[PDB]
Structure 1
Amino acid sequence: KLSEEQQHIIAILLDAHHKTYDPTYADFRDFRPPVRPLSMLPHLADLVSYSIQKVIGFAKMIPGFRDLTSDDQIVLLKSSAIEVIMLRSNQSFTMDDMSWDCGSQDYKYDVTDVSKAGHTLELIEPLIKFQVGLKKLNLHEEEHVLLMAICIVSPDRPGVQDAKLVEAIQDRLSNTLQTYIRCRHPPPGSHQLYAKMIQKLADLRSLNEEHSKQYRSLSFQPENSMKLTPLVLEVFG
């Protein structure tokens, strides 16, 4: 049985995601256009920049998040942004041809497109494997939103100060999730589903680390960092 509090948490997170993820992708017309050797860097930098803004807007709505110091909010968002972008992108990802399909041909991104943003298969191959293994969980939208919120409120991000508080917020989300699965996810889809979802959070840490390495390498060249956005530079370094 989901308590009243746990049902509330899910309603809040569903709404927060609905208010921050336009599944029609209408705002993509505002990005510098896709061109198809770092020819996708302007478009994809704009997409990621927009996505960071949407991730922040979702985070602010996570119950308990606002109770954190303004400093702990910052550290959590800086370290998780790329991971929550990779998670929320699973909604446009399609196993049909292993691409992110955002409404139209111009806005359909494949392995070649990511490599034309400056990344290598060292990143891209595990990223597609992650997206595939995530889609294969066939998560309920309730689970998807709890996983993103649990990803953001992680007490072990380096620089976190009030870890005991971040832990308490996350536990209340983790318990909600464990209870949701038990109450509302029918077998066989439910079999070790929580353990599997937690495994996706570890896979994201490894994705974050390789993304960071390639981003530092990309952005060290002032001519590439010139093509990024002020928000990407601020959040990614």
Structure 2
Amino acid sequence: QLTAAQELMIQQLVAAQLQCNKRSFSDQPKVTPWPLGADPRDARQQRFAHFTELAIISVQEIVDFAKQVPGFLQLGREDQIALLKASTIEIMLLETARRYNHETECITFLKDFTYSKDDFHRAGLQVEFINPIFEFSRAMRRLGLDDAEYALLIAINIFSADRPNVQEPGRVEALQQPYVEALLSYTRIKRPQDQLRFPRMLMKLVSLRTLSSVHSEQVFALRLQDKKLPPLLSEIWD
């Protein structure tokens, strides 16, 4: 059985997740609306802007989230910054997968709005990034994670000691381990008869690293098409 500490650390995470997601419902109508009624280059830019604008919202939700993960604020500020520079896209990819719906083959963001493979392509993104996103999301759906599992995976993802420019990786590892132990024990209990579900979970952190590279390749490729990231996204990903 889960310990009280372990249950609390899941409940802490799931609840922080919810308070950070109020940024999503408030800032939903503020955004550049997705262009209805468009011909064949005006609309291509608006969709792109729209996608950046949701990304910004997510970056700020991930900042706010991390600040509430116990231990995070007590890491040196440079390591905090370094963990969030690296884990941000990956948390976004988890959140994208978490909102994937296999009936419609569409991803949900900010409560209501949904996107297809083709919306992503209508925003000027290339197939080399879009296809892995949807395979990841499909893969993540075959694992059937609940909120607790996703939460724990995001916490583990933040506390990755081997990110670039971490100056006290040891302190990061010490914060990561309890969350990994928690997930181990959680998966055991939920699914006693599936000894491979936990490993498959950790293996998604492997996929997330490569997907992080593919995203950098995508932002690289986007500047050749007059599409430079806005200021808050430039400082994380250029």
**TM above 0.5, one fold?**
yes
Are 1:86 and 2:87 counterparts? Answer: no
Matched residue SS, 2:227? helix
Cα deviation for residue 167 of structure 1 reads 0.7
Q: Mapping of 1:38-53 within 5 angstroms?
A: 38-39=44-45, 40-53=47-60
Cα deviation per residue 1:21-56 (whole Å; 9 max; x = unaligned)? 259845321111212653410100000100110111
Matched residue SS, 2:191? coil
Moved more, 68-77 or 38-47: 38-47
Matched residue SS, 1:157? coil
Moved more, 24-33 or 146-155: 24-33
Cα deviation per residue 1:132-189 (whole Å; 9 max; x = unaligned)? 1101211121111000111111011111110111111111111111111123x1344x
**More relative contact order, 1 or 2 (CA 8 Å, 6+ apart):** 1
Q: Which residue of 2 aligns with 1:178?
A: 184
Matched residue SS, 1:224? coil
Matched residue SS, 1:101? strand
Matched residue SS, 2:34? coil
Moved more, 1-10 or 202-211: 1-10
Match of 1:133 among 131, 134, 139: 139
For 1:117 and 1:68, the matched residues in 2 are separated by 37
For 1:192 and 1:67, the matched residues in 2 are separated by 34
Are 1:142 and 2:168 counterparts? Answer: no
The answer on whether the counterparts of 1:88 and 1:148 sit within 8 Å (CA) in structure 2 is no
Cα deviation per residue 1:193-225 (whole Å; 9 max; x = unaligned)? 21011111111111100100111221366x422
The answer on whether the counterparts of 2:23 and 2:57 sit within 8 Å (CA) in structure 1 is no
Are 1:202 and 2:209 counterparts? Answer: no
For 2:130 and 2:176, the matched residues in 1 are separated by 29
For 2:108 and 2:174, the matched residues in 1 are separated by 37
Are 1:165 and 2:171 counterparts? Answer: yes
Cα deviation per residue 1:99-156 (whole Å; 9 max; x = unaligned)? 113455xx22111111223321111111101001101211121111000111111011
For 2:192 and 2:174, the matched residues in 1 are separated by 29
Q: Which residue of 2 aligns with 1:16?
A: 16
Structure 1 gaps, min length 5 = none
The answer on whether the counterparts of 2:98 and 2:137 sit within 8 Å (CA) in structure 1 is no
Q: Kindly, what percent of the aligned residue pairs are identical?
A: 32
Cα deviation for residue 234 of structure 1 reads 1.7
For 2:219 and 2:133, the matched residues in 1 are separated by 15
For 2:129 and 2:19, the matched residues in 1 are separated by 30
Structure 2 gaps, min length 5 = none
The answer on whether the counterparts of 2:97 and 2:140 sit within 8 Å (CA) in structure 1 is yes
Are 1:119 and 2:125 counterparts? Answer: yes
Q: Which residue of 1 aligns with 2:227?
A: 224
User: Residue type matched to 2:195 in 1?
Assistant: H
Matched residue SS, 2:107? strand
CA RMSD, Structure 1 to Structure 2 (Å): 2.0
The answer on whether the counterparts of 1:49 and 1:231 sit within 8 Å (CA) in structure 2 is yes
Number of equivalences: 230
Matched residue SS, 2:29? helix
